[PDB]
Predict the 3D structure of the following.
Amino acid sequence: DIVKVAIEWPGANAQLLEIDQKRPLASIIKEVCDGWSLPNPEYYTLRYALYVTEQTRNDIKNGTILQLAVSA
Amino acid sequence: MQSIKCVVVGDGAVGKTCLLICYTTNAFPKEYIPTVFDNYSAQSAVDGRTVNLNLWDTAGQEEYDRLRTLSYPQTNVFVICFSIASPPSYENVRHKWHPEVCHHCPDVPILLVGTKKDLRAQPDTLRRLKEQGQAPITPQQGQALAKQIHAVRYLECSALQQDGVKEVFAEAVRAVL
Ligand SMILES: Nc1nc2c(ncn2[C@@H]2O[C@H](COP(=O)(O)OP(=O)(O)NP(=O)(O)O)[C@@H](O)[C@H]2O)c(=O)[nH]1
Ligand SMILES: [Mg+2]
C-alpha cells in the first residue's frame, strides 16, 4: 500500500512523496532529511500541518500535508 | 537538452488528467478519478529541438488547494484549463487561477486551454447549461480571457476526440524555449 503526501520544511520547497507503507518511518525520515541536506534524522519526526507514529502511520490519507519537525 | 517543468491547473473535472493521458498514450479513461498529484515525463521535439517535458498534474478540488500550491516553485510554464462546457470554470480562471499563479510565480508564462471542445454543440450540454441561462464558452470568449490574463496563447482541444492536445504541449515548451 502507498500514500501520497507533501512534506514541508521552512525555507525550503516541499517534497511531494509517495510513501511506501511497508518501509519504517525511520528510513523515510532519513531520505526526507537528505532531501534538504539535514543530518541527524533520528531527531526529526513527521507531524501534521499531531505526530505521525508507527502506530497511526496508516491513518494518513492521500494528499495530506506533513511537516518535518524537530523532535521534543 | 533542457528540461521544462510544466504544471497543469484548473477547476476540478475540467479534464486536466485526460489531457495528460491523451498526450502520453492516446487513451481515454473510463471514470472521473480526482487527482491528488501525479507526474508524467516525456521527450518531445519542438521546432527541430528536443526537450525533457516534465508534466506535473495538479488537483482541482478545493480539498487539495494548499497541496497544489506546493508544486508551484520553479515552474517553467503553466497550462491553465477551463471546460468549454463549464462557464464556472471559465470565470474561476481570471478570478481565482490567474491571480493565484501570478502571486506564487510572477513572470512565468501562462498558456490558456479550453478543454472538452467537443461538447460545444452537444444537445445535452446545451440544454443543461440553457436551464441556468448560459451556453458553452465561445472561441471569442476564450480570447478575451487570454488577453485579460496575458496568456501566451489560447488553445481549444478535446482529449476525447484527440484534437489539439499535441499542439497544447508543443506550445507549452515554446513559451519557455
Ligand atoms: N466529453 C469529454 N469529456 C472529457 C474530456 N476530457 C475529460 N472529460 C471528462 O471530464 C471529466 C473530468 O476528467 P479529468 O481529466 O479527470 O478532469 P481533471 O481536471 O483532471 N479533475 P481533477 O482536478 O479532480 O484532477 C471526466 O469524466 C472525463 O471523462 C473531453 O475531451 N471530452
Ligand atoms: Mg485530474
Q: What stands out?
A: Chain B has one domain: 1-177. Residues B 16-17, 35, 57 surround magnesium ion (ligand 2) (CB under 6 Å).
